[PDB]
Design a protein around this ligand. Structure first.
Ligand SMILES: NC(=O)c1ccc[n+]([C@@H]2O[C@H](COP(=O)([O-])OP(=O)(O)OC[C@H]3O[C@@H](n4cnc5c(N)ncnc54)[C@H](O)[C@@H]3O)[C@@H](O)[C@H]2O)c1
Ligand SMILES: NC(=O)c1ccc[n+]([C@@H]2O[C@H](COP(=O)([O-])OP(=O)(O)OC[C@H]3O[C@@H](n4cnc5c(N)ncnc54)[C@H](O)[C@@H]3O)[C@@H](O)[C@H]2O)c1
Ligand SMILES: Cc1cc2nc3c(=O)[nH]c(=O)nc-3n(C[C@H](O)[C@H](O)[C@H](O)COP(=O)(O)O)c2cc1C
Ligand SMILES: Cc1cc2nc3c(=O)[nH]c(=O)nc-3n(C[C@H](O)[C@H](O)[C@H](O)COP(=O)(O)O)c2cc1C
Lengths: 495, 501
């Protein structure tokens, strides 16, 4: 046919054909039901996991895969998880969000002790109201030389994130060296533009004025982008817009090309993608869409290294595709913001949505007493007044009727995640567990495997998705050439 | 491995776009040649290499592609005949149409396409089994041998009847599937029922009513209820807003499980729709890997579609942010919602208001600061005027049940607006443009973005066959680019994507 080869009698056994196919190190010569490593009808080259993604991403972050495990709040993306993945040459971002500085600093030491030469990243979340908490974290990272952050939840540039970026700039031949790297996670084009563009001169100038950065650093900062890597986050667990991966990522890739042509950075900007990736199929499709790297995910909270209770991790292994839903978010409850949570084996969603329903419909906690009793009785397990007293002790504390109601309600929204993380007994039906459909897709893919179990390791999962993607790229390639592959061999299974 | 050409960017771009000829790439001074005795190589793989070849065989079509059904004849005879003439499968929008109308369509379409291809939408009527039975009867009578079954929550005697009746043996004793079913689903529970053989309880009853034979009942237990399973992700109209990248993989896994168990002679095929308006999305879905891809919101924007000029013109400016969820007419009381355009129309806002009022109040007595606004802006008549007229509509269907219940009366009045709103958009009813109900998903906005700065900016230049061609050709072209990129080659950014030139 199209091929310049011949072979002498190959292998004709399905379990010899299956084994040879899964070897991505050796090329495949297919003869019409025979595989070898007289004529040749189909051919598949030797393409491993390294043919997926942007090689520059791997080079720059010193990682073995174009893959990174996204941050998970309140230390769910824990030190154990980061160290486990870091030791395998896989990038993971530490879930610093919601943790106190002393806690985060502790993590920096452990992690840096375990991984002197990387790789790891730290999540730098945007605190729009508490601007100092953001400053403390940047200072903490600069002090301990944390040279990679995943910046997320940003709506615009802030002096702190610009400061972090600019401070890591230096010269070698006079070429610019980007010491501090930024992965900006976005779902909107407006925000992505600001991270693909050089830092604004106005903010730069201010930092030079305060002796935070040098003049040559201000000069350098105008010639390089704010972020090296841009993660388009599609529909996902926790906070999300629920945007489609297949529309979002292409929009951001186009945006990238536009800005790259304009500023013509020496090192190109890279766009990766996360959101809904729990199987090799999806992983491969995302790569072929143009993604430099792929991001997970809900599947990582289900692993043993994660900072989630045993009850929760066990529950996540049974969660299916339709077992997730949207529920009021604690921090942006009044504004109607929602996040994606598990709704199976937990009643938090129903109860949290009830609070929002009650909050929007009624003027004060002084609400029908038939309705009020149920809340105190089942949800809060205390008088609304008893709950209020404790909120005051925690804390914005009185003039407004609706604002008071919200603060009491937020007691449940806030705690509910803490219960799931720590494993608070007797509050299981109230666990707030963030997850997306990706987890259910993974559980479906993994059904009837060792992974049905305590047997779930983040490194193993990464390896499957990466190897699975590479294998299925080969299968697709062969199918495209009219070769008939046994249905049982077309997909990567965990076995 | 063969041995060492053109360097002209225009020649490189042109040669790359020829999927019929192989590509020999040399990196001096990249060089591309179509003859050899070689840094990178790309074989000749056209649109025929995407999808499941069996899907094309079985439906006698050029592409692993089908234009999904659009209700009330939006997927019109014109659209079906246009796509059928190009060897592309299209499903006729029978939903909501009266039998005499559907029969008319069968003739026109069968006259134009004696040997296919086409399909007819068989929608689930939970409320009235008579509408479903009449349609199955109509299809069996006129030998409509392909239906797209959608909106089903599980098996129904009618859909089982349709499937079983088309079963027969060849001289060799093998089972021949005469009537084909494409089941469109978004849940694993429902997909299982269509991937599994028909239940004997329902089968036996059909044998007892003389509808099918005993050997047909026997055959029906060794073949699946559907040949093709369309996983419908986030899409226009009715949807539960699921991600394509999680749903399709879940259904493919489910497929493999059931295939291993029953080991059908001809395997089940799982295809996918929902959010496909660009070559990028098309290729990703294939890569995932679907047997076929389905559209879509982009088809309602084409000239062949049964949508008003005002609507089609509006759809050419619709962006991804311009769609939202609104109460559905058929399932208004149950709180069901569907995805509609919210740009250039106030239907969504007004329809959501009706649901708010319906759930909060016991009867139209007593709503009247609110009541006046509805009468004033939405209905443009008194609620009483609307109630009458509705009485005339259902009297020559019974209304009798509504008198006993004020809640049922309120809903029936409200549904006057929910129902006619789509009719206005379809017909192009003047003076009610701000009330048009237009079903669409994010895929349309993605298409409009992809097509900007091209001849397709003009709605008048939008043809279903041309769109199908772009998505299929675009996907095939970009698969080649990916293949080359993976072979370590560097392709000019301007050539990496299929653009409608
Ligand atoms: N997918 C994502 O991006 C994602 C997912 C989860 C969380 N996050 C972010 O990470 C962090 C998670 O932290 P969080 O929001 O769970 O905690 P938080 O501290 O941000 O919670 C804020 C709410 O907690 C309530 N609260 C907590 N403890 C209380 C107590 N003892 N008494 C009364 N009220 C109390 C407060 O009233 C407040 O309204 C946040 O920044 C969140 O925005 C992001
Ligand atoms: N994606 C999808 O699956 C999808 C999308 C759109 C529609 N559909 C299906 O298409 C079909 C189209 O039906 P539909 O929902 O447009 O309307 P319909 O024919 O189901 O009738 C809608 C309701 O509107 C009211 N109504 C309609 N016309 C009226 C009049 N002249 N006077 C008074 N009241 C009137 C009645 O209450 C009626 O029950 C439905 O079966 C729907 O389920 C499916
Ligand atoms: C429990 C949980 C907590 C998360 N916390 C954060 C966070 O604090 N900051 C952040 O940027 N992303 C957070 N994410 C998002 C992930 O980093 C990643 O972007 C997303 O989960 C990928 O989509 P997927 O979950 O559908 O794979 C969280 C995700 C989950 C499931
Ligand atoms: C205006 C419109 C009407 C539709 N009507 C029907 C219908 O009556 N029956 C049906 O099964 N699907 C219907 N669909 C769904 C399509 O057949 C197709 O499955 C879906 O639009 C694909 O998703 P996409 O719009 O994101 O491409 C309709 C879609 C649109 C946009």
């Amino acid at each position: 046919s199209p091929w310049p080869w011949q072979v002498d009698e190959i292998s004709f056994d399905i379990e010899s054909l299956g084994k040879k196919l899964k070897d991505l190190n050796q090329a495949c010569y297919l003869i019409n039901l025979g595989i070898a490593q007289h004529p040749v009808s189909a051919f598949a080259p030797a393409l491993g996991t390294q043919s997926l993604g942007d090689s520059n991403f791997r080079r720059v972050h010193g990682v073995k895969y174009a893959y990174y495990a996204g941050a998970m709040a309140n230390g769910i993306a824990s030190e154990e998880l980061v160290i486990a993945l870091g030791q395998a040459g896989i990038l993971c971002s530490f879930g610093a969000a919601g943790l106190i500085p002393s806690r985060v600093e502790a993590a920096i030491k452990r992690i840096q002790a375990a991984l002197p030469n990387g790789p790891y990243a730290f999540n730098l979340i945007h605190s729009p109201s508490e601007q100092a908490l953001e400053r403390g974290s940047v200072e903490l990272f600069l002090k301990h030389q944390v040279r990679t952050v995943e910046a997320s939840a940003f709506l615009g540039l802030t002096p702190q994130i610009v400061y972090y970026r600019a401070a890591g700039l230096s010269r070698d031949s006079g070429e610019i060296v980007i010491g501090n790297k930024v992965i900006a996670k976005i779902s909107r084009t407006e925000v992505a533009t600001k991270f693909m563009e050089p830092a604004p001169v106005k903010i730069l100038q201010q930092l030079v004025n305060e002796g935070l950065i040098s003049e040559d650093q201000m000069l350098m900062a105008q010639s390089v982008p704010m972020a090296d890597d841009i993660t388009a986050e599609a529909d996902s667990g926790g906070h999300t817009d629920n945007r489609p991966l297949v529309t979002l990522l292409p929009t951001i890739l186009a945006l990238k090309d536009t800005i790259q042509a304009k500023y013509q950075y020496k090192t190109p900007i890279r766009v990766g993608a996360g959101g809904g990736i729990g199987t090799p199929d999806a992983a491969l499709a995302t790569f072929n869409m143009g993604a430099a790297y792929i991001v997970t995910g809900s599947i990582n909270q289900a692993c043993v290294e994660a900072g989630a209770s045993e009850h929760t991790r066990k529950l996540l292994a049974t969660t299916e595709m339709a077992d997730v839903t949207m529920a009021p978010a604690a921090d942006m409850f009044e504004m109607g913001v929602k996040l994606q949570v598990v709704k199976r084996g937990t009643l938090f969603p129903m109860r949290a949505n009830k609070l929002y329903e009650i909050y929007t419909r009624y003027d004060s906690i002084e609400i029908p007493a038939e309705e009020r009793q149920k809340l105190e009785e089942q949800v809060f397990r205390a008088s609304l007044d008893e709950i209020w007293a404790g909120t005051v002790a925690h804390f914005k504390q009185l003039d407004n009727p609706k604002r008071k109601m919200a603060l009491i309600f937020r007691w449940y929204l806030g705690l509910s995640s803490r219960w799931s993380n720590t494993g608070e007994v007797g509050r299981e039906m109230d666990y707030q567990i963030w997850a997306g459909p990706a987890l259910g897709a993974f559980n479906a893919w993994a059904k009837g495997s060792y992974l049905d179990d305590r047997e779930r390791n983040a490194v193993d999962l990464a390896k499957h998705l990466m190897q699975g993607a590479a294998y299925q790229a080969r299968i697709n390639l062969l199918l495209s050439q009219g070769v008939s592959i046994p249905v049982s061999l077309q997909r990567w299974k965990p076995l």
